[PDB]
Amino acid sequence: VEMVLKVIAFKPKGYFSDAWNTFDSLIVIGSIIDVALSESITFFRLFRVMRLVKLLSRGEGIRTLLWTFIKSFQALPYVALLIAMLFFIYAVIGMQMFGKVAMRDNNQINRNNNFQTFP
Amino acid sequence: CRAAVKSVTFYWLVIVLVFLNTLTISSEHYNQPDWLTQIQDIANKVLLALFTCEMLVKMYSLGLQAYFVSLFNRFDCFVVCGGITETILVELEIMSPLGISVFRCVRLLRIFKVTRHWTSLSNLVASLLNSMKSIASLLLLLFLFIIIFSLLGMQLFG
Amino acid sequence: FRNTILGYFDYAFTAIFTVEILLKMTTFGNYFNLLDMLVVGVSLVSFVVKILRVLRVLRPLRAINRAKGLKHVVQCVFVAIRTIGNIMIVTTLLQFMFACIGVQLFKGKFYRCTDEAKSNPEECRGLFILYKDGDVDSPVVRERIWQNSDFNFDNVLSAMMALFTVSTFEGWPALLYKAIDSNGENIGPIYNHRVEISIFFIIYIIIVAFFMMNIFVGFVIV
Amino acid sequence: FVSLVIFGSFFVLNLVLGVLSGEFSKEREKAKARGDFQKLREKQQLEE
Amino acid sequence: SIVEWKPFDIFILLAIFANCVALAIYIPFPEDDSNSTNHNLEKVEYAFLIIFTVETFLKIIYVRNGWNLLDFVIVIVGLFSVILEQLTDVKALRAFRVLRPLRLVSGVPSLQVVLNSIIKAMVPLLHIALLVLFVIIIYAIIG
Amino acid sequence: ACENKGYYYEIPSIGAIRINTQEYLDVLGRPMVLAGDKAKQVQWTNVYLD
Amino acid sequence: KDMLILVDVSGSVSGLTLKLIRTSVSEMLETLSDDDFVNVASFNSNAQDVSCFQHLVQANVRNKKVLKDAVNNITAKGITDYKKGFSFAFEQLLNYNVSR
Amino acid sequence: VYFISFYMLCAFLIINLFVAVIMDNFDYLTRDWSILGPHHLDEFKRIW
Amino acid sequence: SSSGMIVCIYFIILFICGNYILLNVFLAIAVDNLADAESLNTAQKEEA
Numbered sequence: 035v036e037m038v039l040k041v042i043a044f045k046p047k048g049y050f051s052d053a054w055n056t057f058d059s060l061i062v063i064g065s066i067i068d069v070a071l072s073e074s075i076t077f078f079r080l081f082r083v084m085r086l087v088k089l090l091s092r093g094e095g096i097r098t099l100l101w102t103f104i105k106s107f108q109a110l111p112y113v114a115l116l117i118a119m120l121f122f123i124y125a126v127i128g129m130q131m132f133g134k135v136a137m138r139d140n141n142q143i144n145r146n147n148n149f150q151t152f153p
Numbered sequence: 154c155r156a157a158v159k160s161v162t163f164y165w166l167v168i169v170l171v172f173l174n175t176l177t178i179s180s181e182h183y184n185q186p187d188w189l190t191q192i193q194d195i196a197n198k199v200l201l202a203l204f205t206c207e208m209l210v211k212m213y214s215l216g217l218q219a220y221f222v223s224l225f226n227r228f229d230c231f232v233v234c235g236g237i238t239e240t241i242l243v244e245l246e247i248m249s250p251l252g253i254s255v256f257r258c259v260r261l262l263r264i265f266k267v268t269r270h271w272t273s274l275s276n277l278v279a280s281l282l283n284s285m286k287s288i289a290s291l292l293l294l295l296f297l298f299i300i301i302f303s304l305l306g307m308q309l310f311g
Numbered sequence: 312f313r314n315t316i317l318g319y320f321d322y323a324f325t326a327i328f329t330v331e332i333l334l335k336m337t338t339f340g341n342y343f344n345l346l347d348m349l350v351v352g353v354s355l356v357s358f359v360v361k362i363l364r365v366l367r368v369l370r371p372l373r374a375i376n377r378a379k380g381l382k383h384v385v386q387c388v389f390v391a392i393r394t395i396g397n398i399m400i401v402t403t404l405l406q407f408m409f410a411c412i413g414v415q416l417f418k419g420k421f422y423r424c425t426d427e428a429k430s431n432p433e434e435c436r437g438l439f440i441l442y443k444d445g446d447v448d449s450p451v452v453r454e455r456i457w458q459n460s461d462f463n464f465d466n467v468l469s470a471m472m473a474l475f476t477v478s479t480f481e482g483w484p485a486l487l488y489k490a491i492d493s494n495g496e497n498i499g500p501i502y503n504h505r506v507e508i509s510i511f512f513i514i515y516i517i518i519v520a521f522f523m524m525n526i527f528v529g530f531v532i533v
Numbered sequence: 534f535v536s537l538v539i540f541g542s543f544f545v546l547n548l549v550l551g552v553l554s555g556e557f558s559k560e561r562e563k564a565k566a567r568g569d570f571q572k573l574r575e576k577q578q579l580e581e
Numbered sequence: 582s583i584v585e586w587k588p589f590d591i592f593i594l595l596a597i598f599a600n601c602v603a604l605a606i607y608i609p610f611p612e613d614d615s616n617s618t619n620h621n622l623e624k625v626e627y628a629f630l631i632i633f634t635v636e637t638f639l640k641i642i643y644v645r646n647g648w649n650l651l652d653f654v655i656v657i658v659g660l661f662s663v664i665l666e667q668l669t670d671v672k673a674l675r676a677f678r679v680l681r682p683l684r685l686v687s688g689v690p691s692l693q694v695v696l697n698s699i700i701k702a703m704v705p706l707l708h709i710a711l712l713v714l715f716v717i718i719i720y721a722i723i724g
Numbered sequence: 725a726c727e728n729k730g731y732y733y734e735i736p737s738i739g740a741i742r743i744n745t746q747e748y749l750d751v752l753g754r755p756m757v758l759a760g761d762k763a764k765q766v767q768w769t770n771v772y773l774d
Numbered sequence: 775k776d777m778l779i780l781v782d783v784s785g786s787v788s789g790l791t792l793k794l795i796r797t798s799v800s801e802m803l804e805t806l807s808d809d810d811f812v813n814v815a816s817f818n819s820n821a822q823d824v825s826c827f828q829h830l831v832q833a834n835v836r837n838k839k840v841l842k843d844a845v846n847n848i849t850a851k852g853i854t855d856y857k858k859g860f861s862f863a864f865e866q867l868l869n870y871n872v873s874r
Numbered sequence: 875v876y877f878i879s880f881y882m883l884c885a886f887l888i889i890n891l892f893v894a895v896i897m898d899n900f901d902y903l904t905r906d907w908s909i910l911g912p913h914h915l916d917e918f919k920r921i922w
Numbered sequence: 923s924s925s926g927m928i929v930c931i932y933f934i935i936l937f938i939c940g941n942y943i944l945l946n947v948f949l950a951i952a953v954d955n956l957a958d959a960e961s962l963n964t965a966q967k968e969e970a
């Protein structure tokens with residue numbers, strides 16, 4: 035009801051100026067698809083909880099802290115490139131040396147933790 | 154008189170003496186050969202004499218009052234006092250099975266003879282000395298927090 | 312099959328780089344450029360092999376001199392290391408002294424038998440009966456071996472590696488209770504023999520793991 | 534889980550350390566107009 | 582009532598420190614077991630309860646203070662615990678005696694100041710604590 | 725233990741139960757060996773499966 | 775022999791050290807024959823028999839089964855009283871109404 | 875040497891990234907809202 | 923099950939309120955004492 039009740043007073047042309055309502059609508063369509071499909075399925079039922087951050091992040095003092103740090107992270111993207119390059123170098127070296135070790139359930143090198151594949 | 158003690162050639166010699174003294178401690182390991190054991194205790198007394206010779210020579214070159222001015226010099230004579238006590242007690246009728254371990258960790262304290270002349274972070278040490286009333290108070294508050302939670306945990310899960 | 316196809320890709324890749332590197336040399340007659348020859352040089356020479364096969368991981372590293380922001384960030388790191396180079400000398404000296412003290416305390420005292428009934432290597436021999444999960448109705452035959460702890464204080468090298476893992480706060484309770492039970496030179500553990508030996512670990516953690524690791528981070532901030 | 538660790542622990546620890554360091558710095562310039570640094574410099578300058 | 586300014590103030594402070602040692606040497610035995618040392622420490626508890634009860638009834642002559650409120654509440658729980666136990670998880674109620682060591686912070690002016698600075702430094706971190714709570718709530722519901 | 729002519733045992737784990745609960749027969753046989761040749765009497769057990 | 779097994783069932787023996795005690799008592803009953811008389815008693819601020827026997831019994835295959843079953847059913851609770859536990863044990867060795 | 879060197883390097887670059895982000899926020903971290911700041915101008919723009 | 927799960931708040935409070943104090947003790951010396959040494963070194967150079 036909110037989605038239709040808002041467009042008839044704010045117009046679709048200007049409705050997308052706000053950042054929150056652009057993604058807020060997608061939950062409404064997503065939520066209504068699965069309830070129709072109720073009577074594959076986890077993609078849209080998961081988005082129901084995401085409505086909490088859409089309006090409860092209106093406190094001034096926590097939004098500023100989040101926005102300031104996120105913008106700071108975006109302004110320093112090359113520092114995080116070293117960590118990725120460090121991970122890439124050491125992971126590749128690990129496959130050559132310790133990639134042929136057999137996986138055992140009782141060992142620390144097991145089906146969940148090993149060097150057999152790059153991920 | 155005092156020219157030799159403050160000479161630059163004396164500075165390098167004591168640096169060497171600290172080196173092989175540390176090597177006599179860091180070379181000890183489990184199942185070490187008997188010959189290496191014989192070197193360690195023999196060189197323990199030999200380096201003790203050289204430090205004592207350095208101790209005795211330094212004392213009779215400047216004056217007792219000036220030595221106590223330096224903080225380290227009082228500490229430096231403390232270590233050599235226990236160094237001579239170690240050999241005489243070990244060779245005496247006191248077995249002290251654990252006493253060897255504690256004494257061997259005392260003569261390791263002269264490694265700081267080389268870290269007293271950085272000129273780069275010695276000012277940091279001076280900052281940690283006049284803030285003792287602030288450092289100790291914070292450490293004790295943490296201790297009181299641990300003490301309370303230890304006694305509370307004895308009641309619930311004892 | 313995947314390795315062969317990837318090997319085929321590496322065939323065409325080294326052709327582009329070796330052709331490209333010639334235009335650089337034809338038109339120029341530093342150290343970063345010397346790295347380009349080294350990385351491509353491994354490829355042609357490869358075309359023990361294991362040493363060179365590992366050595367070809369330098370492919371992403373040569374991309375530094377082709378990005379304005381990547382050069383500066385890498386340059387700032389080496390300058391940052393130089394500033395923090397003074398702290399890494401004091402904390403290495405402190406760990407070395409603690410390792411030497413630790414060797415004097417727990418030298419060879421971390422040995423134990425596979426069955427917790429023999430306390431010296433003489434009788435820790437042969438076969439013994441193990442009861443699975445403590446049940447007396449499920450016995451099983453096992454060999455008893457006079458084993459040593461993976462992290463011990465046999466020498467200074469082992470003590471420093473054992474103390475490094477303590478500073479990371481990983482498995483340090485296991486080493487703490489292994490040291491408490493340390494009875495003697497070549498004999499097995501005793502439950503809660505010397506609790507007061509925990510003072511060595513408490514002091515080391517406060518001095519090194521807490522004080523030095525935080526004065527390190529505070530140094531970078533200021 | 535990997536996103537929970539990165540956002541939950543690594544990111545929040547950055548916020549806590551940055552904010553806490555922001556309060557330790559706030560008192561640093563505030564304490565300049567109290568003489569504590571000058572008194573410590575005065576005793577250090579004349580110690581040599 | 583008039584002499585409470587300095588002479589015996591160390592004694593009441595020393596009484597809390599002595600009570601701390603009595604709490605440390607107690608051995609919690611499993612399944613209602615005990616020994617001889619625990620038997621004596623119960624009697625020492627009666628001695629310490631009276632000392633902190635007499636002073637509480639002596640300082641009344643303070644009631645709205647934060648530290649004095651903590652001192653008053655532990656005493657009345659102390660009398661409540663001993664009375665109810667005698668006339669019978671009742672032993673779990675004696676966990677309020679662990680707050681008595683906390684009275685050492687109020688007895689040292691030079692040590693209460695460092696505690697106050699830490700407590701008032703939590704305000705800038707409350708915005709972060711609120712954010713962590715929302716992140717855990719969101720991930721718990723997603724889980 | 726020895727104020728009353730006995731012996732002291734420690735059983736810290738399951739592996740120590742088997743041996744420590746049969747060592748009390750060493751103490752009980754002390755007066756039997758001091759008797760001498762008058763303790764060398766042949767006895768016969770109950771019926772059991774070999 | 776005329777054995778009398780005292781089992782400490784005070785609070786401090788609860789846990790692993792009670793499982794060890796129960797297995798230890800059952801293993802010592804296996805070293806007994808029809809010529810030995812045994813009884814098992816426990817004490818925690820009060821000494822009492824763990825079974826229905828109340829005196830020394832012949833320790834045959836059937837009586838030992840009763841004792842073994844009762845030993846495997848004891849719980850740890852209370853305080854330790856060696857004086858009351860040893861008085862009970864010493865009185866049962868002086869009975870002499872029964873065959874020993 | 876593979877795991878010990880990785881732990882030191884990964885820990886070093888993580889705090890290198892943590893502090894660098896913190897460096898870009900001393901203006902906000904040490905905002906000192908009592909005296910003034912850009913937040914007041916934002917309120918002025920909103921009212922405007 | 924039962925009410926035995928509520929006792930977990932002891933470990934949550936001990937962890938949260940314990941690690942917070944550690945950041946106000948060991949990190950309060952790294953910033954209020956090392957910065958002074960750098961400031962002392964900065965002032966020492968000017969006087970020398």
Ligand SMILES: *[C@@H]1O[C@H](CO)[C@@H](O[C@@H]2O[C@H](CO)[C@@H](O)[C@H](O)[C@H]2NC(C)=O)[C@H](O)[C@H]1NC(C)=O
Pocket residue numbers: 869870871
């Ligand atoms: C059997 O043992 C009891 C004690 O365990 C002896 O004590 C007698 O018990 C009976 C029953 O009450 C009574 O005769 C007396 O109370 C006790 N004393 C005497 C002298 O009899 C008892 O003597 C033992 N023998 C018999 C045959 O009972």
Ligand SMILES: CC(C)CCC[C@@H](C)[C@H]1CC[C@H]2[C@@H]3CC=C4C[C@@H](O)CC[C@]4(C)[C@H]3CC[C@]12C
Pocket residue numbers: 172173175176179180181182466467468469
């Ligand atoms: C004066 C000091 C600091 C010099 C540096 C010491 C280094 C280079 C030396 C000193 C003692 C040496 C150790 C002495 C004994 C052993 C035991 C042996 O089975 C393996 C090598 C090992 C572990 C040595 C490694 C190298 C070592 C640690």
Ligand SMILES: CC(C)CCC[C@@H](C)[C@H]1CC[C@H]2[C@@H]3CC=C4C[C@@H](O)CC[C@]4(C)[C@H]3CC[C@]12C
Pocket residue numbers: 255258405408409412507508510511514518
């Ligand atoms: C800063 C470092 C390098 C030097 C200061 C550390 C000294 C004070 C510490 C290091 C290890 C400690 C020892 C660790 C273990 C024991 C065994 C115990 O039964 C008595 C105390 C004793 C002997 C400790 C005394 C204090 C001690 C020697």
Ligand SMILES: [Ca+2]
Pocket residue numbers: 614784785786787853854
């Ligand atoms: Ca008991």
